[PDB]
Scaffold this active site. Structure first.
Site, PDB file in Angstrom:
ATOM      1  N   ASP A   1      45.690  31.690  38.381  1.00 13.57           N
ATOM      2  CA  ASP A   1      45.964  32.816  39.248  1.00 13.57           C
ATOM      3  C   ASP A   1      46.978  32.555  40.346  1.00 13.57           C
ATOM      4  OD1 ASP A   1      45.752  35.295  40.604  1.00 13.57           O
ATOM      5  OD2 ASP A   1      43.728  34.917  41.384  1.00 13.57           O
TER       6      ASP A   1
ATOM      7  N   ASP B   1      52.353  37.583  39.957  1.00  9.37           N
ATOM      8  CA  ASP B   1      50.919  37.335  39.880  1.00  9.37           C
ATOM      9  C   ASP B   1      50.384  37.220  38.473  1.00  9.37           C
ATOM     10  OD1 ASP B   1      48.166  37.248  40.356  1.00  9.37           O
ATOM     11  OD2 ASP B   1      47.998  39.318  41.082  1.00  9.37           O
TER      12      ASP B   1
HETATM   13  C1  LIG Z   1      46.670  38.473  33.426  1.00  7.33           C
HETATM   14  C2  LIG Z   1      45.340  38.721  33.987  1.00  7.33           C
HETATM   15  C3  LIG Z   1      44.256  38.945  34.419  1.00  7.33           C
HETATM   16  C4  LIG Z   1      42.930  39.273  34.872  1.00  7.33           C
HETATM   17  C5  LIG Z   1      42.070  40.060  34.101  1.00  7.33           C
HETATM   18  N1  LIG Z   1      40.829  40.378  34.480  1.00  7.33           N
HETATM   19  C6  LIG Z   1      40.402  39.921  35.663  1.00  7.33           C
HETATM   20  C7  LIG Z   1      41.170  39.136  36.518  1.00  7.33           C
HETATM   21  C8  LIG Z   1      40.663  38.684  37.851  1.00  7.33           C
HETATM   22  C9  LIG Z   1      39.315  38.357  38.039  1.00  7.33           C
HETATM   23  C10 LIG Z   1      38.832  38.041  39.296  1.00  7.33           C
HETATM   24  C11 LIG Z   1      39.685  38.029  40.385  1.00  7.33           C
HETATM   25  C12 LIG Z   1      41.038  38.330  40.225  1.00  7.33           C
HETATM   26  C13 LIG Z   1      41.980  38.361  41.430  1.00  7.33           C
HETATM   27  C14 LIG Z   1      41.328  38.009  42.800  1.00  7.33           C
HETATM   28  C15 LIG Z   1      42.146  37.607  43.998  1.00  7.33           C
HETATM   29  C16 LIG Z   1      41.297  36.592  43.289  1.00  7.33           C
HETATM   30  N2  LIG Z   1      43.240  37.558  41.166  1.00  7.33           N
HETATM   31  C17 LIG Z   1      44.287  38.372  41.307  1.00  7.33           C
HETATM   32  N3  LIG Z   1      45.575  38.029  41.219  1.00  7.33           N
HETATM   33  N4  LIG Z   1      43.909  39.730  41.479  1.00  7.33           N
HETATM   34  C18 LIG Z   1      44.801  40.892  41.576  1.00  7.33           C
HETATM   35  C19 LIG Z   1      42.540  39.810  41.581  1.00  7.33           C
HETATM   36  O1  LIG Z   1      41.904  40.837  41.735  1.00  7.33           O
HETATM   37  C20 LIG Z   1      41.521  38.659  38.956  1.00  7.33           C
HETATM   38  C21 LIG Z   1      42.463  38.806  36.100  1.00  7.33           C
END
Ligand SMILES: CC#Cc1cncc(-c2cccc([C@@]3(C4CC4)NC(=N)N(C)C3=O)c2)c1
Length: 390
Positions: free
Chosen positions: A36, A232
């Site tokens: 991430d 991202d």
């Molecule tokens: C490619 C891709 C993907 C994906 C798919 N489903 C869930 C997630 C997923 C799961 C949990 C948290 C996250 C987060 C939070 C900030 C930490 N990471 C991120 N950049 N964003 C916008 C989020 O909302 C993403 C990512």
């Protein structure tokens, strides 16, 4: 390619995230971790959860250190609470080093874990400024660079399959590469073009021009970066600021006007299907984002195809049709260059030189008529004015 040990170390897909295997503790506990670039915490499931078949057990790690501090992380959709600590962390298909890093042990969560994603934690690769609870909690990559001789750079090759992968297939398929400390030349074709990292918090960049099939969207460039533009790997879609989204969808609709799609399709809610192999890729336009270059008054462009922005999905009736969802959506928090962008390109997060590189990905999906592209240079004036300020 000079990093064979790291090539093909990712699995997953845009809809559920791309992940890398890591180990935490002594003896090592294996976990799958979401890659991430949009966050800065290393947070792992540390208690039973319905969607987890494994989790970090601090009591079984002789090297576990309790920081005696909790963390509450609320997101737009989803949240988690955890307990802060440190432990020894390694990446089996990575650099051959072990580092002591901060770990947020997730004890409670809501809509955080994704059923069937196959990952049990997240690796926040962005900067300390956005780490939770505050910037004193050193991110994993900062710890890695400080403790080892690994260069201050990583690169990501996210590989969309171009078609749906069922449960078994997604587990057995190569989802891409995360090269820690270097650039692997086998992951891309053509040249790498670099855009500056505007500020070190998110991986913030500046978009200077947008085109749909070569037609300029013609908006004040500040609109494209309102209130920021970020790269991202933790977002599925290409997300655009409200006004930009409205202008881009109107132009994408106009370019694809030989076929009419329901509003729910453009809203990214409903899928559209075509008879097996008949997807009319050619009626959909290419999308080009011009990014500020490293040289004054110079820019370059990255161009994606509908094979990047139409996300393959399995039909409700699991028929033989080829189905997709529109993977461009609106944002109220700026542009987000998610997996839709990243799947087209090999992306170099050159932290050492405060720049992000883009090159055509060796694994981007395309057809015999069009390819994704990274081209330049272009003369672009007053690109600094494209950046937003509160
Ligand atoms: C490619 C891709 C993907 C994906 C798919 N489903 C869930 C997630 C997923 C799961 C949990 C948290 C996250 C987060 C939070 C900030 C930490 N990471 C991120 N950049 N964003 C916008 C989020 O909302 C993403 C990512």
């Amino acid at each position: 390619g000079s990093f064979v040990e790291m090539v093909d170390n990712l699995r997953g897909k845009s809809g559920q995230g791309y992940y890398v295997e890591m180990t935490v503790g002594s003896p090592p506990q294996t976990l799958n971790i979401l890659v991430d670039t949009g966050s800065s915490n290393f947070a792992v499931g540390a208690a039973p959860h319905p969607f987890l078949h494994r989790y970090y057990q601090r009591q079984l790690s002789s090297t576990y250190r309790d920081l005696r501090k909790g963390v509450y992380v609320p997101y737009t959709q989803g949240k988690w609470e955890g307990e802060l600590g440190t432990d020894l962390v390694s990446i089996p298909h990575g650099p051959n080093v072990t580092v002591r890093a901060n770990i947020a042990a997730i004890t409670e969560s809501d809509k955080f874990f994704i059923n069937g994603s196959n990952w049990e934690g997240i690796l926040g690769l962005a900067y300390a400024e956005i780490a939770r609870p505050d910037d004193s909690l050193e991110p994993f990559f900062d710890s890695l660079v400080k403790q080892t001789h690994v260069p201050n750079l990583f690169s990501l090759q996210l590989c969309g399959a171009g078609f749906p992968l069922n449960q078994s297939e997604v587990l057995a398929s190569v989802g891409g590469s995360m090269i820690i400390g270097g650039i692997d030349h086998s992951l891309y074709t053509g040249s790498l073009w670099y855009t500056p990292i505007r500020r070190e918090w998110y991986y913030e960049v500046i978009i200077v021009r947008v085109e749909i099939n070569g037609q300029d969207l013609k908006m004040d460039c500040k609109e494209y970066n309102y209130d920021k533009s970020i790269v991202d790997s933790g977002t599925t879609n290409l997300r655009l600021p409200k006004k930009v989204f409205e202008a881009a969808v109107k132009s994408i609709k106009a370019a694809s006007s030989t076929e009419k799609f329901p509003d729910g399709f453009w809203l990214g809610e409903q899928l559209v299907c075509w008879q097996a192999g008949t997807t009319p890729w050619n009626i959909f336009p290419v999308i080009s984002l011009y990014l500020m270059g490293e040289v004054t008054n110079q820019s370059f462009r990255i161009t994606i195809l509908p094979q990047q922005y139409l996300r393959p999905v399995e039909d409700v009736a699991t028929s033989q049709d080829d189905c997709y969802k529109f993977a461009i959506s609106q944002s109220s928090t700026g542009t987000v260059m998610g997996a839709v962008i990243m799947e087209g390109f090999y992306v170099v997060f050159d932290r050492a030189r405060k720049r992000i590189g883009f090159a055509v990905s060796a694994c981007h999906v395309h057809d015999e008529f069009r390819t994704a592209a990274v081209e330049g240079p272009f003369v672009t004036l007053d690109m600094e004015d494209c950046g937003y300020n509160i």
